Subunit: 141 residues, 6 copies
């Protein structure tokens, strides 16, 4: 009905410069409800399960260690139609093909080292919520 | 010549959270001239005259009371080519079909409860100025 | 009980550069309630009544015309303990004796041309509300 | 040596309006290092242990439920001389005795419902880190 | 390899209102490296060489003196793929055909008096770097 | 009369993180006039002349190389009563003895590595203008 949850995590590239701000600011500007915010140094198994469909890539081996090197912050948000709303908030993957006024279109430099990853589909979010955010760790209201 | 006036009013949905700020900020940053700013609890006749062409709508009855429930703020602005400039500043009606970096594309959630209404055309503005903003209540310079 | 109203008006010196923004932003960020916002080109009688106790001043004649030259914006706000809260928000009259992070301590240059005037006391506000803001023009909630 | 940790938690009063932003922004502006960020609905035992020295207060019973009503967010930060630096960042308890440009001096309204609580002393932080933030849940670097 | 330099200068129209900020902010928000920042009152020979290919224009005579009247600020930036990045950062020349969230799409009013000019191509920058920014006046790192 | 010039330079510590923004923003918020902005890698002679009265200090040798290691940006500003106005804008040297809402009171961590240096007195500015900012490189208006 109105329990659309979206998993979004900030890659360590931004947290090196911090810049965690203005993200929740944009989220509340749109008017979304925070449901959870937990950050942990995810182990290699979690990273490979996150990109199990992307393992057969030469860049997969590089990224699975590059993002592992620094600490990472994960977050889940609740809102109506938040699916694809987060996507349009971020912007398309390629920095060149990313208009300003967005997240990916105003901060990222290269596809190799981006800052934000998210759920492409509701079905993807249905597993991006689990195995990293343990249950009964959120708020329902 | 250069007397293009545009009537723009903030619906009570935003004033519930306030958030009246940054609007005049964007207007002055673009470089528009304020001509008037008056707010009143508009009566039902004013609301129905505002949407006389939209009366034959099932959603009209709901909105004409929903926006009447809270207090509203109205505003008029003077600037060159401000017509359709305000429109591109806000964004298209549907929140999904509204890119970020705008007004309607960064704050609104659903078409039912939006925050900003404006003049689609110059002819529309020619009556949106009147019957709510009483004359000799503005500044010409 | 909780009906503390404060009259605050922005002098034309700032409206020349606009800069009306961030004021309502600070007010809502503190958590005050807007009760009214009307602006008019005040006549000489209104200005002299505003400073009837300051008429016997050589600078009074200069200011009563300098601020009259441009348009002015007046505003009233409702909040608990807003009295002297607005004062500490603005800062002491002399720009030199005004710490940063405030209104008067971050924008004003000289005592001759300031941007904001306010109510020193509750009794002062009891008349600063009237004779400029006509009654039944506010919102009680 | 350089492992000064400070426990700071945002009370639900602000999270009702969100406003979690700009806090990490100020922290990175000063140049502090984030060490942990976890939020949970703290049980009554945690709240009473937090204010064990304040239990013999009539206001204690009210606050221990008022802050429990909504969800709360806790946070720990690492930085040199962060002790009393967080304190001067927030401001003195009474909103009246709190200059602007701070946290407590720019957001809070009344002593009854504040938004931020922190560690008065290093010894206080030595227990404010524990019993809420479980160990091996932070980052050392 | 990674020595892509772009010459960008702010026309005096903005410097009349200042507004030099939020420009470098976006550059560091994207994460570009500053290589040089010098401002001088450019002489007519410098101005005509800047628009040598635009001399045969009726508007050329007007613009060459309009921006000459006030002081101008020039700047050069270093970054990967910086070319066409500033171009999309500003926006297309016509203010009407310029979406918000950008520089040209959020500040300029008319094509006659814009605020920012830049290098369309790398080859254009290869002469825009010289004859205004004297060599050995930058930083390589 | 009204030609009060103040020399202010940003140390490389901040330029490592950039953060050059918001400084000109505060300056225009107060309403000061920019007169010059030039940045160069100052040689050792310039640095020792800058602190000729501070040479007989053990920390002098460390700082004269620490600030020389990175590039530095210098700036001069024109405004009425700008003397000691810049000082109150920055804040007292010790970060602990520096209230928030300022420059030194919101960014600096330790006295060893600060970000901003300025002119204590008008007489000091009378030489801080020269020997670094070459004459006929400013704007008088």
């Amino acid at each position: 009905a109105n329990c659309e949850r979206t998993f979004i995590a900030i890659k360590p590239d931004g947290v090196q410069r911090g810049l965690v701000g203005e993200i929740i600011k944009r989220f509340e500007q749109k008017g979304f409800r925070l449901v959870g915010l937990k950050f942990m140094q995810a182990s290699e198994d979690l990273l490979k399960e996150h990109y199990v469909d992307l393992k057969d890539r030469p860049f997969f081996a590089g990224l699975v260690k590059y993002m592992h090197s620094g600490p990472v912050v994960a977050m889940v948000w609740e809102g109506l139609n938040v699916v694809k709303t987060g996507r349009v908030m971020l912007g398309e993957s390629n920095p060149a093909d990313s208009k300003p006024g967005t997240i990916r279109g105003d901060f990222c430099i290269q596809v190799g080292r981006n800052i934000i990853h998210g759920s492409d589909s509701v079905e993807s979010a249905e597993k991006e919520i689990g195995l990293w955010f343990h249950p009964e760790e959120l708020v329902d209201y």
